[PDB]
Design an enzyme around this catalytic site. Sequence first.
Site, short mmCIF file in Angstrom:
data_model
loop_
_atom_site.label_atom_id
_atom_site.label_comp_id
_atom_site.label_asym_id
_atom_site.label_seq_id
_atom_site.Cartn_x
_atom_site.Cartn_y
_atom_site.Cartn_z
CD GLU A 79 -3.03 -3.34 4.60
OE1 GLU A 79 -3.26 -2.48 4.77
OE2 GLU A 79 -2.63 -4.56 3.79
CE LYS A 261 -2.73 -0.04 0.62
NZ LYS A 261 -3.05 -1.17 1.89
CG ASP A 277 -1.06 17.11 5.62
OD1 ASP A 277 -1.00 16.15 4.90
OD2 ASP A 277 -1.00 18.11 5.75
CG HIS A 376 -3.59 -19.98 -0.72
ND1 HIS A 376 -3.34 -18.78 0.23
CD2 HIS A 376 -4.99 -20.07 -1.15
CE1 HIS A 376 -4.12 -17.95 0.44
NE2 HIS A 376 -5.45 -18.59 -0.64
NA NA Z 1 -0.96 -4.78 11.27
NA NA Z 2 -0.24 4.74 -1.15
NA NA Z 3 -1.24 13.41 11.39
NA NA Z 4 -1.08 -4.00 1.53
#
Ligand code: NA
Ligand code: NA
Ligand code: NA
Ligand code: NA
Lengths: 421, 421
Positions: A79, A261, A277, A376
């Site tokens: 991301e 998040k 994990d 914007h």
């Molecule tokens: Na990044």
């Molecule tokens: Na999450």
């Molecule tokens: Na992992």
């Molecule tokens: Na995000």
Amino acid sequence: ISWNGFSKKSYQERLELLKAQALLSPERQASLEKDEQMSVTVADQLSENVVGTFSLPYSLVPEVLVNGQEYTVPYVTEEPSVVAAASYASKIIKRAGGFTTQVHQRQMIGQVALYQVANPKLAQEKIASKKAELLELANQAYPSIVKRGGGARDLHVEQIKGEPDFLVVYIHVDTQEAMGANMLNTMLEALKPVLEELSQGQSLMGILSNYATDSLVTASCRIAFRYLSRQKDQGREIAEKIALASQFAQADPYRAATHNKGIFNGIDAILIATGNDWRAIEAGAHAFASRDGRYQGLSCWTLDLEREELVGEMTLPMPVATKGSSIGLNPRVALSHDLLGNPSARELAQIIVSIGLAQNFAALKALVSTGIQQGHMKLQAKSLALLAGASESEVAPLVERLISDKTFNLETAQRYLENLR
Amino acid sequence: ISWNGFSKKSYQERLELLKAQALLSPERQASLEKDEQMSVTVADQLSENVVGTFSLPYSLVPEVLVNGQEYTVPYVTEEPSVVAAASYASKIIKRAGGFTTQVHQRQMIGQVALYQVANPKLAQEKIASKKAELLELANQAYPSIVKRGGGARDLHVEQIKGEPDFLVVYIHVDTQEAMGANMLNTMLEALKPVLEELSQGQSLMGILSNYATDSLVTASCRIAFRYLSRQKDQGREIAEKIALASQFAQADPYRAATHNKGIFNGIDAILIATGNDWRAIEAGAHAFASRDGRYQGLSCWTLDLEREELVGEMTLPMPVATKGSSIGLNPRVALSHDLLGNPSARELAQIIVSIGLAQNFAALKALVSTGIQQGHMKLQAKSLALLAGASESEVAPLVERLISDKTFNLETAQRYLENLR
Ligand code: NA
Ligand code: NA
Ligand code: NA
Ligand code: NA
Ligand code: NA
Ligand code: NA
Ligand code: NA
Ligand code: NA
Ligand code: NA
Ligand code: NA
Ligand code: NA
Ligand code: NA
Ligand code: NA
Ligand code: NA
Ligand code: NA
Ligand code: NA
Ligand code: NA
Ligand code: NA
Ligand code: NA
Ligand code: NA
Ligand code: NA
Ligand code: NA
Ligand code: NA
Ligand code: NA
Ligand code: NA
Ligand code: NA
Ligand code: NA
Ligand code: NA
Ligand code: NA
Ligand code: NA
Ligand code: NA
Ligand code: NA
Ligand code: NA
Ligand code: NA
Ligand code: NA
Ligand code: NA
Ligand code: NA
Ligand code: NA
Ligand code: NA
Ligand code: NA
Ligand code: NA
Ligand code: NA
Ligand code: NA
Ligand code: NA
Ligand code: NA
Ligand code: NA
Ligand code: NA
Ligand code: NA
Ligand code: NA
Ligand code: NA
Ligand code: NA
Ligand code: NA
Ligand code: NA
Ligand code: NA
Ligand code: NA
Ligand code: NA
Ligand code: NA
Ligand code: NA
Ligand code: NA
Ligand code: NA
């Protein structure tokens, strides 16, 4: 040596700077320089139906200060801006003295669910009276952890109501550096027949729980208003808005989800880098977020008006490992652990919660800022133009003048529409 | 052509079988055969502070039947047995006619939080009366999606109570094939000044919500008892235990977390393969799990005793994408989409929820089984031996005889201790 310019440096230059920092052994540095990957052969040992491998970026978040110790943190994320935001948050918080962290407890919880128990309270007492013998049996079932200094430490039995009712036996286990799934499952298999006999019931399952409440870890930070902005009273304003943003995530599940998040953008990134994990950590933390009967933000941002500081705090269940198949087999995971100075699982856990809080800080700060992109600005000036009472032909000239200004509101757009007309 | 033997085949043989299935173009097949990875250059464009790449296994889950259409599903997971379990679950469910799925809705929700609103109810009415003009303004702010057939479709305003109270404006947006983060943020920036003016309040933030309740997708399956086990009444027994396991995850948050974790072992694996943001999907689903005031299992397993079938069902918010940077830039992500027949986002979402339910099925079935490894048999026989009243010297001979049997309980261990003494 400084990390200044690390983002704008080329790939090759970043590697040279890292090398100058002298954080990796000659072997680990060379492994990184040839971008050594987990091989198909290794992948084929780890997973099933393997037909190849899959790659993601691998980045560094420098200057992560945790209990007076500075770390260079590895991230795996696809991301855009997540690493940049974590790095920015980390610099600010380091200047503010870094994170202060504590491990409340580090044990794993496993459970056996019993049903068709005619007398749950008598079963509860019987099992509880055999507590010591049951713990001994669990410990004989997995002797290697007892030798290392761990093992089953406690056991309790609860009546869980529903359709139908369950009698649930929970074991609390010191798994040391391991996550302990195999260990816990093995101990529970051994207890199963005894628990059935004591309760005169049937065992449904014996399994580890990912709701890791015997593994809570808290991070906090304390940021002077002057680090939020150099401008006179702008720092206070930013701090207020961050605290309000924090309050908003307590109130609205729609905000809470996004709030949490953003924390996991960072947490999952370091979990992947360290071969941990992330599904287990996600599940436990999101369940923990719901503990008071509403899904809520996992962190809290408050104001200390007397000291003029913004305070951030977050508690999470963080049962991470420093021993496991991925840690043993993925050459970059082994590198990530060396990079971090080979922390214990407890130490790693404190780093990870701090990382989450840093990530949260950057998201909140950016979210409450009023200095935004040119695209914007033209957009917001258009809204104010129409709001002032502009017609079709009046929009374009009004925007041109509004964007020429440093700052602008409705009264400014009304003033400029007055002059134009 | 059959997939039989796919797991036990070597890496090279799996690639030959895949090639025989004729699922990939010549280019995609060659890309896979040279195990082509996302390059450092591409990684460096995707993320920040990039110093290399990080690899994980890439596997196939064959025979995923969704609304009469069969898929070969790509997985990225480092956890042993996750792919094998998904593949097993998928075969069983295909034999049972596969999954039936529906998309309830596919829109994204964004929010603007307003504070210092003196008169929230008057503000609420004013904004609601300007609904059409606000939607038009949002749509002019991002015209490309309107051209593709999407755009802002609805807007509502709610009073959210807390410390302090917030007035929250929610927009509902058709983002087509995109996740829509940039789109929603852009539309919200445009609305901000107008919403402030209408409410006589201050905007705290304008941001997408990861609690994607306008994106719910349900999968179900229907499995005859005979597919659970060929033995006379053993299939019914397995079905009963799975349903009880499902009921247990509704009752105990400690079970729910693990239940939902197992679902995400599969879901995150396909999300990574298809270049989708798993943190967003995790957050929304775990929040959804809490909607009734308790953290609960995301799926339901029930019995149809008349038809002798085990029924599985799961609803999740699944706002996945088929357009995005990772999808464009990671060569294996592009491959995963081709492999799946280039589904729309809606189609992909239905596949993913089905995958989660398959993964859940395998976890539950294994959890309630009584045929386990030899290591745990010697262990359980030891427990029954001691439980029967055996001393130190009597344990070893008693276990040897108990493991020689096919099945055994306490009465068997008592019988064998009687004969020995
Ligand atoms: Na990044
Ligand atoms: Na999450
Ligand atoms: Na992992
Ligand atoms: Na995000
Ligand atoms: Na690597
Ligand atoms: Na394999
Ligand atoms: Na790749
Ligand atoms: Na720091
Ligand atoms: Na510190
Ligand atoms: Na370090
Ligand atoms: Na990265
Ligand atoms: Na432990
Ligand atoms: Na635990
Ligand atoms: Na725990
Ligand atoms: Na606890
Ligand atoms: Na704890
Ligand atoms: Na811990
Ligand atoms: Na602190
Ligand atoms: Na927030
Ligand atoms: Na956040
Ligand atoms: Na990993
Ligand atoms: Na999870
Ligand atoms: Na956790
Ligand atoms: Na956990
Ligand atoms: Na919060
Ligand atoms: Na820990
Ligand atoms: Na790994
Ligand atoms: Na290495
Ligand atoms: Na490496
Ligand atoms: Na370590
Ligand atoms: Na962030
Ligand atoms: Na690849
Ligand atoms: Na970069
Ligand atoms: Na790797
Ligand atoms: Na199937
Ligand atoms: Na079907
Ligand atoms: Na396919
Ligand atoms: Na895999
Ligand atoms: Na696997
Ligand atoms: Na949409
Ligand atoms: Na949404
Ligand atoms: Na939605
Ligand atoms: Na909704
Ligand atoms: Na919906
Ligand atoms: Na949907
Ligand atoms: Na069905
Ligand atoms: Na369950
Ligand atoms: Na599961
Ligand atoms: Na698992
Ligand atoms: Na992804
Ligand atoms: Na990806
Ligand atoms: Na979701
Ligand atoms: Na979501
Ligand atoms: Na359930
Ligand atoms: Na969808
Ligand atoms: Na990717
Ligand atoms: Na490709
Ligand atoms: Na490829
Ligand atoms: Na596609
Ligand atoms: Na599974």
